[PDB]
Amino acid sequence: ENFAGGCATGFMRTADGRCKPTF
């Protein structure tokens, strides 16, 4: 119920509402 991309390769959306790479 919430997905708009905008992150990098293996970037996981952080609770802060940002894209962060798990690697």
Taking the C-alpha atoms of 16, 18, 3 and 6 in order, what is their torsion angle to the nearest 10 degrees? 170
CA distance linking residue 1 with residue 9, whole number of Å: 21
CA distance linking residue 14 with residue 6, whole number of Å: 12
Q: What is the CA radius of gyration of the chain?
A: 8
Within 13 Å, how many C-alpha atoms sit on residue 5's CB side? 2
Contact of 10 with 22, CB cutoff 8 Å: yes
Experiment type: NMR
CA distance linking residue 5 with residue 21, whole number of Å: 13
How far does Cα 21 stand from its chain's mean position?
8
Residues 6+ apart with CB under 8 A from 23: 10
Beta strands in the chain, from DSSP E residues, in sequence order:
11-14, 18-21
